[PDB]
Amino acid sequence: ASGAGKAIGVLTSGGDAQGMNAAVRAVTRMGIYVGAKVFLIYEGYEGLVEGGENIKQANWLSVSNIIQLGGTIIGSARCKAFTTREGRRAAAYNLVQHGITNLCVIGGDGSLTGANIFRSEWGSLLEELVAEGKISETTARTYSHLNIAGLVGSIDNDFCGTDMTIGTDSALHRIMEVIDAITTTAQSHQRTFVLEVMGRHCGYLALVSALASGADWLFIPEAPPEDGWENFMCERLGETRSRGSRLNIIIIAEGAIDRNGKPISSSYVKDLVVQRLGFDTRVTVLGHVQRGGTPSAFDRILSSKMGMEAVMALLEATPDTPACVVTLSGNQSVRLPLMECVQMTKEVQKAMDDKRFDEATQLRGGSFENNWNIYKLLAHQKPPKEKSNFSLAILNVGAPAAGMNAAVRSAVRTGISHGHTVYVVHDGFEGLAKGQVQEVGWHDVAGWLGRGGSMLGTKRTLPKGQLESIVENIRIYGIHALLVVGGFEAYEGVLQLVEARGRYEELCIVMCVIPATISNNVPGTDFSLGSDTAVNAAMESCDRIKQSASGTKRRVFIVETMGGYCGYLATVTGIAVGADAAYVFEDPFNIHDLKVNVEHMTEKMKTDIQRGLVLRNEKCHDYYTTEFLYNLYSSEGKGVFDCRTNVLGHLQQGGAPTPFDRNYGTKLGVKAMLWLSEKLREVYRKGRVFANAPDSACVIGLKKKAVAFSPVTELKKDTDFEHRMPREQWWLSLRLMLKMLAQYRISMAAYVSGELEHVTR
Ligand X SMILES: O=P(O)(O)OC[C@H]1O[C@](O)(COP(=O)(O)O)[C@@H](O)[C@@H]1O
Q: Compare residues 56 and 246 and give the one whose CB is closer to ligand ATP.
A: 246
- Cβ distance to ligand X smaller for residue 102 or 519: 519
389 marked among binding-site residues? no
Helix (H) or strand (E) holding 13: strand 7-13
Kindly write out the interface string for residues 320-359 of this chain, putting x where it contacts ligand ATP by CB under 6 A and - elsewhere: ----------------------------------------
Is 169 or 492 the residue whose CB approaches ligand ATP more closely? 169
Residue 558 is labelled as binding a ligand: no
Cβ pair 649, 592 in contact under 8 A: no
Q: What is the CA radius of gyration of the chain?
A: 27
517 annotated binding-site participant? yes
Catalytically active residues, by annotation: 156
Task: State how far the alpha carbon of 368 is from the alpha carbons of 160, 183, 220, 291, in Å.
Answer: 10, 25, 11, 21
Determine how many CB atoms are found less than 10 A away from the CB of residue 267.
Answer: 12
The C-alpha atoms of residue 57 and residue 38 are separated, in whole angstroms, by: 6
Considering beta carbons, is residue 18 or 414 the nearer one to a copy of itself? 18
Burial tier of 224 (Cβ tally within 10 Å: 0-12, 13-18, 19+): buried
The residue among 308 and 545 lying less far from ligand X, judged by its C-beta, is 545
Residues in contact with ligand X by the rule CB under 6 A: 398-399, 487-488, 517-519, 521, 562-564, 644, 653
Candidate list 28, 116, 209, 294; residue touching a copy of itself; CB under 8 A? 294
| Of 30, 67, 198, 363, the one binding a copy of itself by CB under 8 A | 198
Tell me how far, at minimum, the Cβ of 415 lies from a copy of itself, in Å: 22
Q: Which does 109 bind (CB under 5 to 8 A by kind): ligand X, Mg ion, a copy of itself, none?
A: Mg ion
Q: Which of a copy of itself, ligand X, ligand ATP, none has residue 182 at its interface (CB below 5 to 8 Å by kind)? A: a copy of itself
Instruction: Return the one option of a copy of itself, Mg ion, ligand X, none that residue 564 interacts with (CB less than 5 to 8 A, by type).
Output: ligand X
Does residue 14 interact with ligand ATP by CB under 6 A? yes
Q: Which residues pair with 697 in a beta bridge?
A: 511
Distance CA 258, CA 221 (A): 8
DSSP string, 327-358: EEETTEEEEEEHHHHHHHHHHHHHHHTTTSGG
For residues 325 and 339, what is the distance between their CA atoms, to the nearest angstrom?
A: 10
DSSP secondary structure string, 642-668?
Answer: EEEEEE--GGGTSSPPPHHHHHHHHHH
For the bound state, the minimum distance from the C-beta of residue 565 to ligand X, rounded and expressed in Å, comes to: 9
- Looking at the DSSP bridge assignments, the partners of residue 178 are none
Name the minimum Å distance from CB 80 to ligand ATP: 6
Under 8 Å between Cβ of 47 and 11: yes
- Residue among 37 and 173 whose Cβ is closer to ligand ATP: 173
Binding residue for Mg ion, selected from 3, 9, 47, 110, defined by CB under 5 A: 110
User: Is residue 379 a contact residue for ligand ATP (CB under 6 A)?
Assistant: yes
Q: Is 519 annotated as a binding residue?
A: yes
Residue type, 80: K
Torsions phi, psi of 329, nearest 5?
A: -105, 120
Nearest CA to 584 out of 602, 563, 604, 598 is that of 563
Was 31 annotated as part of a binding site? no
Window 21 to 50, contacts with ligand ATP (CB under 6 A): 45
Strands 688-689 and 684-685: antiparallel
Which residues lie near ligand ATP (CB under 6 A)? 13-15, 45, 78-80, 82-83, 107-111, 113-114, 117, 154, 156, 183-184, 187, 214, 217-218, 223, 225-226, 245-247, 376, 379-380, 446-447, 449-451, 656
Which residues lie near Mg ion (CB under 5 A)? 14, 108-110
Residue set of the binding site for ATP: 15, 78-79, 108-111
Residue set of the binding site for beta-D-fructose 2,6-bisphosphate: 460, 517-521, 555, 562-564, 618, 644, 650-653, 724
